[PDB]
Design a protein around this motif. Sequence first.
Motif, mmCIF file in Angstrom:
data_model
loop_
_atom_site.group_PDB
_atom_site.id
_atom_site.type_symbol
_atom_site.label_atom_id
_atom_site.label_comp_id
_atom_site.label_asym_id
_atom_site.label_seq_id
_atom_site.Cartn_x
_atom_site.Cartn_y
_atom_site.Cartn_z
ATOM 1 N N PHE A 1 -32.108 61.159 39.159
ATOM 2 C CA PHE A 1 -31.389 59.917 39.423
ATOM 3 C C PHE A 1 -31.197 59.692 40.915
ATOM 4 O O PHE A 1 -31.276 58.555 41.395
ATOM 5 C CB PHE A 1 -30.037 59.916 38.716
ATOM 6 C CG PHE A 1 -29.267 58.645 38.911
ATOM 7 C CD1 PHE A 1 -29.800 57.432 38.515
ATOM 8 C CD2 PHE A 1 -28.020 58.660 39.505
ATOM 9 C CE1 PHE A 1 -29.100 56.262 38.699
ATOM 10 C CE2 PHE A 1 -27.314 57.491 39.690
ATOM 11 C CZ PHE A 1 -27.856 56.290 39.287
ATOM 12 N N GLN A 2 -30.916 60.755 41.664
ATOM 13 C CA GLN A 2 -30.776 60.613 43.109
ATOM 14 C C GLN A 2 -32.083 60.144 43.737
ATOM 15 O O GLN A 2 -32.082 59.296 44.636
ATOM 16 C CB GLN A 2 -30.330 61.939 43.716
ATOM 17 C CG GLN A 2 -29.749 61.817 45.108
ATOM 18 C CD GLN A 2 -28.385 61.165 45.106
ATOM 19 O OE1 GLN A 2 -27.605 61.337 44.170
ATOM 20 N NE2 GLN A 2 -28.087 60.410 46.156
ATOM 21 N N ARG A 3 -33.211 60.685 43.274
ATOM 22 C CA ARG A 3 -34.505 60.227 43.768
ATOM 23 C C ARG A 3 -34.738 58.766 43.411
ATOM 24 O O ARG A 3 -35.320 58.010 44.196
ATOM 25 C CB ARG A 3 -35.618 61.101 43.197
ATOM 26 C CG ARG A 3 -36.928 60.976 43.942
ATOM 27 C CD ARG A 3 -38.101 61.407 43.091
ATOM 28 N NE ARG A 3 -39.355 60.885 43.616
ATOM 29 C CZ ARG A 3 -40.103 61.499 44.522
ATOM 30 N NH1 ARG A 3 -39.760 62.673 45.022
ATOM 31 N NH2 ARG A 3 -41.225 60.918 44.937
ATOM 32 N N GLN A 4 -34.305 58.356 42.220
ATOM 33 C CA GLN A 4 -34.423 56.956 41.832
ATOM 34 C C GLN A 4 -33.611 56.065 42.761
ATOM 35 O O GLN A 4 -34.071 54.993 43.169
ATOM 36 C CB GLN A 4 -33.966 56.782 40.386
ATOM 37 C CG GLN A 4 -34.680 55.682 39.633
ATOM 38 C CD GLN A 4 -34.408 55.736 38.145
ATOM 39 O OE1 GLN A 4 -34.292 56.815 37.564
ATOM 40 N NE2 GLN A 4 -34.301 54.571 37.520
ATOM 41 N N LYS A 5 -32.398 56.497 43.106
ATOM 42 C CA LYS A 5 -31.593 55.748 44.065
ATOM 43 C C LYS A 5 -32.295 55.662 45.410
ATOM 44 O O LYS A 5 -32.291 54.609 46.057
ATOM 45 C CB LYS A 5 -30.219 56.396 44.226
ATOM 46 C CG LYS A 5 -29.294 56.188 43.046
ATOM 47 C CD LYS A 5 -27.838 56.183 43.470
ATOM 48 C CE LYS A 5 -27.362 57.564 43.867
ATOM 49 N NZ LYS A 5 -25.967 57.532 44.377
ATOM 50 N N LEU A 6 -32.894 56.767 45.852
ATOM 51 C CA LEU A 6 -33.633 56.754 47.110
ATOM 52 C C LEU A 6 -34.756 55.726 47.070
ATOM 53 O O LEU A 6 -34.919 54.926 47.999
ATOM 54 C CB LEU A 6 -34.195 58.146 47.395
ATOM 55 C CG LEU A 6 -35.139 58.260 48.592
ATOM 56 C CD1 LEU A 6 -34.390 58.043 49.891
ATOM 57 C CD2 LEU A 6 -35.829 59.605 48.579
ATOM 58 N N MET A 7 -35.549 55.744 46.000
ATOM 59 C CA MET A 7 -36.664 54.810 45.896
ATOM 60 C C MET A 7 -36.168 53.371 45.882
ATOM 61 O O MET A 7 -36.745 52.499 46.543
ATOM 62 C CB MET A 7 -37.479 55.111 44.640
ATOM 63 C CG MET A 7 -38.093 56.500 44.621
ATOM 64 S SD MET A 7 -39.436 56.691 45.803
ATOM 65 C CE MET A 7 -40.848 56.304 44.776
ATOM 66 N N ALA A 8 -35.092 53.106 45.141
ATOM 67 C CA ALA A 8 -34.556 51.752 45.081
ATOM 68 C C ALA A 8 -34.078 51.289 46.449
ATOM 69 O O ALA A 8 -34.317 50.142 46.844
ATOM 70 C CB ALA A 8 -33.417 51.687 44.069
ATOM 71 N N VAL A 9 -33.396 52.164 47.187
ATOM 72 C CA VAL A 9 -32.900 51.781 48.502
ATOM 73 C C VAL A 9 -34.048 51.583 49.479
ATOM 74 O O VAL A 9 -33.957 50.754 50.392
ATOM 75 C CB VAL A 9 -31.897 52.829 49.014
ATOM 76 C CG1 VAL A 9 -31.584 52.588 50.475
ATOM 77 C CG2 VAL A 9 -30.629 52.785 48.187
#
Lengths: 118, 37, 146, 183, 150, 140, 29, 80
Positions: free
Chosen positions: E6-14
């Motif tokens: 999920f943290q990686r997903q947040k990174l990609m989204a940002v």
Amino acid sequence: NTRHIAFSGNKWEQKVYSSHTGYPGGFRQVTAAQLHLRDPVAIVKLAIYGMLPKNLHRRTMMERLHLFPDEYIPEDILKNLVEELPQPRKIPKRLDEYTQEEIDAFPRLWTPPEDYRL
Amino acid sequence: FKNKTVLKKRCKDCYLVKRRGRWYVYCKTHPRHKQRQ
Amino acid sequence: FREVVETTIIEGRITATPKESPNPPNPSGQCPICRWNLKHKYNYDDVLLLSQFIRPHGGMLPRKITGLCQEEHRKIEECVKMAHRAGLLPNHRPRQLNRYLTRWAPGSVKPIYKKGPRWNRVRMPVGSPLLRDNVCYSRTPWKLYH
Amino acid sequence: KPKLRFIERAPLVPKVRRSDIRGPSTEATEFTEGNFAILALGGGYLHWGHFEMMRLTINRSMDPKNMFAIWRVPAPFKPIHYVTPVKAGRLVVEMGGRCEFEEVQGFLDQVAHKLPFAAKAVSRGTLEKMRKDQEERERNNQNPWTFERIATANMLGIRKVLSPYDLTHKGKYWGKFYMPKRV
Amino acid sequence: RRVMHFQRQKLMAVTEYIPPKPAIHPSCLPGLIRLLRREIAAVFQDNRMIAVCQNVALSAEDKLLMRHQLRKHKILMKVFPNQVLKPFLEDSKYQNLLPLFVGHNMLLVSEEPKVKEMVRILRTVPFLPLLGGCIDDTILSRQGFINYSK
Amino acid sequence: GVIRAIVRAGLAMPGPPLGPVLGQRGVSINQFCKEFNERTKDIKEGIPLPTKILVKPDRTFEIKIGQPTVSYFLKAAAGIEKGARQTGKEVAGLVTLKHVYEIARIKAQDEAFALQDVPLSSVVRSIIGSARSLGIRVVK
Amino acid sequence: RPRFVSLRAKQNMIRRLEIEAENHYWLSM
Amino acid sequence: VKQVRVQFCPFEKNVESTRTFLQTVSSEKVRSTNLNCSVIADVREPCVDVLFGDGHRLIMRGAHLTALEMLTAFASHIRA
RNA sequence: ACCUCGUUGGAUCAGGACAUCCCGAUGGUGCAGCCGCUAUUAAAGGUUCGUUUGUUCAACGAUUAAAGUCCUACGUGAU
RNA sequence: CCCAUAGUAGGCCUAAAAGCAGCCACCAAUUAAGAAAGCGUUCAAGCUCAACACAAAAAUCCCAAACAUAUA
Ligand SMILES: [Mg+2]
Ligand SMILES: [Mg+2]
Ligand SMILES: [Mg+2]
Ligand SMILES: [Zn+2]
Ligand SMILES: [Zn+2]
């Protein structure tokens, strides 16, 4: 005037109210339009019921809710009335309702070609 | 009608029309070409 | 505007045609919408704007004639569909549930019997995505799905 | 010999040794003796069936006297049957001759879609165009924050969640999948 | 695609790409040709009498027969695009010829009028009406051509 | 409707190439071949001849004929019976420009064939291209 | 079950990233 | 259809509606199947007359009309 | 990279899915009709009795409009 | 959307295979033309193009209620 509510979007056809009589094969799914035609109050009643807190006071609260499909209201209720709340949504006007002065005020946006059937 | 995920016109008279929510290929000359999305 | 009259013998006569209002706010603009600074400042209920691009029986007018952009013609067409479905054009008809912002024709949408789980819910579209970029005065953007 | 040469189901002399799918491809990433090709926008293994489809479709659709095709990928060697690992960004089949993109792109895209990984029929011109527009994207992006910057600087302690390979993939590659819109 | 942390997903989204947004939309912001030119310029002087018709309702064989009957005389039939013909009118100072060449137009350039026999030939085909022309810089209507023929 | 045939004047009743092909519309093969033989007598005998028969809706024959073919004519002029295989490198006979002009003199005269161009270039170029396509070299 | 990133989460991450960028600047000298 | 007459005055202001009309419908490509018709072009605001031997006469002042309109009207009348 | 080997029927009552075996509506056909094949929609209703078998399954006999595929801890042994 | 004349059924063989069985060149007329890019003829014939011209599914009963427009 609960009979004259308006849904946004295609909710009249898409929104479905599901209930179960408890008996096998008793699952009933009815669209918003069908529910409105059957009971002109069920939609608003269910909306308020769902929005109320899910505790034992909810049905006591519903006892204080009085839904009427049309303009007619019981005389005792009318005497009880104190205030009228503003309608949450301002009803847009139709062309039939727009005044000629407003139409004149609004500019003509384009020059239609004279030689066009229209 | 035949159910197809991709609608393809088969002859000249096949025409695409979106009806009752989904696309259809209709054809008068070859009703065999009738396709539904 | 030319109209065809019969008596059989039939002939076409050109009648009075409205003209664009003088002094456009933004002269030398691509489409009338741009010329009048209405790029993202009209909605489905702006019948005064919409009816200016409408046949007398409710049909849209062609883009070649109207002069609208491709995107602006699409926006006007969708807004007109929504206004017709909301009943804001009672006089533009071919010859009872109140609605508004109805994207789809009422007869072409199936009931959502099984709305998915929370992470895959089936949402009911509201308004049109073509108006996504309309000027938003609210803190939150328009919700196109309910 | 414009047509694609038939390959063998298994190598005659099995070799010993020399993931093999993840990350950008380092070999056969550029045109050689041709103008069109199948670019592999994703990683995967090519079976003899895949190769046979390549060969048959290309040979039958191709005009032998005006178009020539070449394998830009070795024969199946990795045992499992045998496979040929392919990395994202590698050309699988190349084509030249006195023809045009619009001419070959039809069947090239058909075979690319039948390939086991994301693939695209790309000319030299279109390959250069995609590279240049990716460069333009990464030059003009209005996001102050990029995967490259965050990962390299270890901002937020994000290397606790990222792989060591992420500092070089820069977010454009995940597993065997090459995200092309990722900037 | 296998699910990311999920943290990686947040990174990609940002870190998602954000294209530049212009303030105002740009769209909403503001030798065969010369061969024909010279050929028509030469023809306008070579010809002495000119007429125009609408030989488009005829078949290939019928048009060929009409061409044969015209070539029997010195008259020559010509076809040229209206797109390039319209400038030629103002170039050669033919103002009254503007509202004559629209749609299909077939010129009938000549120097010796066989117009009598040509009209006789047209008579047996009750269509393909003769159109206005301009002989030697003198505009002639159909009645003018008929009078000149007679 | 118009029916096109390239039959040889010599053999007026080859059979399949005339019988079944003409019978669909409804024809009198006897009359057709009689008129074909009449034209064969009128012209040289033993040479392919294009025909422009038009089967009228009233079931009548209007046979229209012109010059012989150009391919066989050129092959005979060059002393060739069967054409070349490659036709781009193979050559069997040579024809001079004077000979080409002489044959063209009696070529641009047919109505159906449309070879009616006033300029000599229009027809000499066409026949030269035909010869080039065939296995004939154009001398000088 | 899948999880999804909200605008609030993106804004929180961006705020933290801005703080860290300022940290980089102040450590650079 | 029995008879049709097309008249216009290009010497006067041009009217391309009737010109395109006669170029299109009054073509042997159509008359081959529509042989029963007798077409005449008497050129001299314009006027297209259609005479049906049964009971009908259709007059079209194709000044403000367009080719599409007049062809559609003609086809509808032919269907009758 | 040797061999070998490791819960279900029936009775009763049935609940449910539709990816429909029959019954209903519709499109296509290499549909003349009868027939079929195919596809869309339809789960209200129905979907047999026997011989041999531990046979889970299977074959066989006679039928039926049909003798559907499944899930329900063999669905169901405090029945 | 309109429209497609013709050197000639271009030649080899191929019963004939002509633009569609194949390989060889792939010229040429008017102004506009592929010895034809696709249907169909044993082969022809007939039709077009190019040329002029103008996404899903399963079994006890869906699953908060709802909401696009009041300034961050
Ligand atoms: Mg079903
Ligand atoms: Mg079970
Ligand atoms: Mg129990
Ligand atoms: Zn069809
Ligand atoms: Zn604009």
